[PDB]
Every structure is written in structure tokens, then in C-alpha cells.
């Protein structure tokens, strides 16, 4: 009573404000975990798999349509009486339809949920990312019909975001879903700290008579491609010792520490994500 | 005993960590390669295979960051390459090392028992 559906307990815990002390732990309570697993294995596994298949088809069609884009200049491009041109245009139409679908789904989520502008950009990262991909697609359409070739820039950012968003569907499989929660926690905590310090050091040591060229040359060192003679020796050696040999290995060590302490927290967050998916599937 | 346990650990790492890592890494690589090759107008790297190989070179410490110039919007190309590098090389490959360390920490007894069962067989 008032657990399955009512303010129901599951809808209270799942849609919490992200300040609740134990939002991730309240789902480990005896009857709730077994109820969510029952709902999953009964109907939400199949629905979620169908959604994943539909998204994979959408991304495949979008990739195919963008791959075979014409190179003539100043769109729109007139369609030729060729089967290939009829496949390309239908793929483009499907891509634009999916973008509109995701834009409207993001608007509906921001309306019915009313995030408080902090949990907006501190929780619900999936919704924002899909919405941002849809925004890129719509901006691409607008630029395309304005006779601007910058439509391709917006389209390729929509494609890389859409392919990186496939990591959303790792939830629904425990091992991959927890690995993806651990990727989120690495990005928010270790990559952020390392990137701040690393960027400060890089900009200082970079400050080839242009700032951009020298910054790129010094960044090549981070990826194992540094020249040491690209165009001084003490500065380059100091930069190498402080970034490559110290800061990048320290990042590995801190990543090892994080993984050791987030094991239980990563599983709870994945379970909460799947509970949110199960509630969304039930409501819609 | 020592080489036996080492091989068992290799088996466990191939089945768990390499698998999870390869799935996420291949998804990222294909997405970023489809974006880069779409941005490219023409030339030597206007094929999916060529761009995929160029972006995979980054994983092995041989990435160019300037392997082509047949495009418009150089900013778009640089941003895509930097995003791919930050997401794979600096994050995912180090996370793999960190997850491999955890696995080593947690599979000593399991790896010795499996080796003993192998020798019994
Ligand atoms: C930063 C990434 C953080 C998000 C993430 O890693 O994974 C989120 C899922 O994301 C996805 O869709 C799948 C794709 C993720 C790809 C990797 C991260 C994005 C990078 Br490719 C970005 Br940088 C590209 C930006 C490109 C933008 C370009 C902008 C230009 C204008 C998890 O978040 P959640 O689903 O909402 O669940 C929350 C949970 O409910 C809550 O209980 C908990 O509290 C929270 O923690 C969540 O778990
Ligand atoms: C229409 C079917 C709609 C549908 O049933 O969903 C199928 C897919 C996936 O939708 P999702 O909610 O699981 O995405 C996750 C979004 N997040 C994280 C914000 C919740 O949506 C779609 O690509 C549908 C749009 C694709 C149309 C092209 C068909 C190929
Ligand atoms: C996930 C992978 C896909 C994500 C793509 C996100 C990149 C979107 C931002 C693009 C910014 C841009 O192109 O403008 C260039 C704009 C101008 O380029 P510049 O004059 O060379 O510096 O630079 C930026 O805005 C950098 C932001 C990245
Ligand atoms: Na190298």
C-alpha cells in the first residue's frame, strides 16, 4: 500500500531532490529491491531492450545519412532521380524526426519534473545530454535551410554526442551499468581536478610564434608525441617532468584510489538509475 | 604455480576488464571516427577505415592531431580530436589500469584455486 503506487514511496525516492541524505540507499530496503527487480524482469526489461534497439537503428541511420552527405556547396541540395538520393533523403528525414522527438522529450521532462536549477546540472545528466544533442540537430537543420555550410559543424557535434549517448543504455546490464557509473564518478572528481591543474601548467609553460601552436606542441607531450626540438630545453624538461612524469601518473594513482572506495556507491547509483528507468517506463 | 596463477589472472582480466573496456572504447571510437570522417571533405582520409585507424593510433601513443587538412571549420576538427583524446586516452585507459589493479587485489585466492583445478584436470 502506497509503495507500488499512491505520493508513492518509489516515486518519492526516485525523484528526490539530490539533497536527501540516503537517496541511493533507501532502495536497498528489503521489499523495494525485490519489487523493482520483479517489475524489471516482468515488463521493463523487454521495453528497455526495444528502446535500445530503436535508438541503435536511429544512430545507424543518422551515421549513414551524414556519411553520404553531398559536397557541392551552399545547401539545400537538390535531390536527383537516383535510388541512393532517395535513401539519403529518407535517412535525413528520419534523423531530423528523431532530433525533434528528443527535443520534445527533453521539454516534457523539464516541464513535468521542474528541476531546481541545481539538480538540473548536478543530477539528470542523461536528460541534458540528449536534449543538447537534439538542440545540435535542430540548429543543424536551421543552418541547412539558411544556406550555411556551418550546418555540418552542428551535425557532426550531434553525431558524436549521439554515439557517446549510447552509454546511457548500459544501465539494464549490472556489470556495464556499474562500469558507466564509475566512468561518471571518474569524470566528475579526478578528471576535473587533474584537468584544472594540468591546464594551468600547460598555459603557463606555453606562454610557432603563436599561443595556439605552442599550446598544441606542448599538449602533444601528454599523448606521447612530444618533439623536444619542434622549433628552451630547461622549460621543456620542467614541463615534461611536472606533467607527463608526475601529474599523469598521479592521476592514475588517484583513479585507483577512487575505484577502491566507490564500489558500493557505484552499485547503489546504478540501482537508482534502473529504478528511475522502471518508473518512467511505468508512467509512459 | 607462479606462471599458472599469472595465466589465470590474464584469463580473468581478458574476460572482465578488457571486455567492458573494449565495448565502451569501441563505441567511443566509432562515434568520434564517424564524426571526423563526416567533417572531412575529401582526400586520403575520407573513408571510415582510414579515420578509424588514425584515431586508434592515439590509443597507442602515435596520434597526429594534424593528420589531415581537407576540411572546413578547423575549430570543429580540433575540438573533436581533443574530446576523443580526453575521453579515451586520458580517462578510459587510466581507468582500465585502475580497474585492473582492483581486480588483481580481489582475485588472488580465486586465481590460485582455478590454477589448482586446472592442474587437477
Ligand atoms: C560529465 C558526464 C556525467 C554524466 C555521465 O557520465 O553519465 C550520465 C548518463 O549520461 C548519458 O546520457 C549516457 C552518455 C554518457 C557518456 C559519458 C558522459 C558524457 C560526456 Br561524453 C560529456 Br563531458 C559530453 C558532453 C557534451 C556536451 C556538449 C555541450 C555543447 C553545448 C549519468 O547521469 P544520470 O543518467 O542522469 O543519473 C544520475 C543518477 O540518477 C543520480 O542518482 C546520481 O546522483 C548522478 O550521479 C547520476 O548517476
Ligand atoms: C519513436 C519511438 C520512441 C521510443 O520508444 O524510444 C526509442 C528511442 C529511445 O528512447 P529513450 O527514451 O529510451 O532514450 C533515452 C533518453 N533519455 C536518457 C533522456 C531518457 O527513441 C528514439 O530514438 C526514437 C526516434 C528515432 C526515430 C528514427 C527511427 C530509426
Ligand atoms: C561528446 C562529443 C561531441 C561533443 C561536441 C561538443 C563540442 C561543441 C562545442 C563546439 C564549439 C565550436 O565548435 O566553436 C568553436 C569555438 C571557436 O573556435 P576558435 O576561434 O578556434 O577558438 O571554440 C569553442 O567554442 C571551444 C569549445 C569546445
Ligand atoms: Na608515443
Author numbering:
A (entry chain A): 385 to 390, 393 to 593, 627 to 650, 659 to 711
B (entry chain D): 560 to 603, 627 to 703
Article sentences:
The capsaicin- and heat-activated receptor, TRPV1, has served as a model for deciphering lipid modulation, which is relevant to understanding how pro-algesic agents enhance channel activity in the setting of inflammatory pain. Identification of a pocket within the TRPV1 transmembrane core has provided initial clues as to how phosphoinositide lipids bind to and regulate the channel. Here we show that this regulatory pocket in rat TRPV1 can accommodate diverse lipid species, including the inflammatory lipid lysophosphatidic acid, whose actions are determined by their specific modes of binding. We captured several states of TRPV1 ranging from channels in which the VBP is empty to those bearing different bioactive lipids, including distinct phosphoinositide species, brominated phosphoinositide analogs and a pro-algesic lipid, lysophosphatidic acid (LPA). Together, our data show how the VBP accommodates a range of bioactive lipids and how occupancy of the site corresponds to the structural status of the pore.
To resolve this question, we exploited our ability to generate TRPV1 protein with an empty vanilloid pocket, into which we introduced tetrabrominated analogs of PI or PIP2 (PI–Br4 and PIP2–Br4, respectively) as contrast-enhancing probes to distinguish these lipids from the other, unbrominated lipids in the nanodiscs. Previous work has established that brominated lipids are faithful analogs of the unsaturated lipids from which they are synthesized. In these high-resolution structures (2.2–2.4 Å resolution), we were able to identify the bromine atoms within the oleoyl tails of the lipids by visually comparing the resulting reconstructions against those previously determined for samples containing endogenous lipids. The well-resolved inositol headgroup of the bound lipids showed the expected differential location of phosphate moieties, most notably at the 4 and 5 positions for PIP2. Furthermore, conformations of both PI- and PIP2-reconstituted channels resemble the apo channel containing a native resident lipid. Together, these data demonstrate that the vanilloid site can accommodate PI or PIP2, where they act as negative regulatory factors to stabilize the closed state.
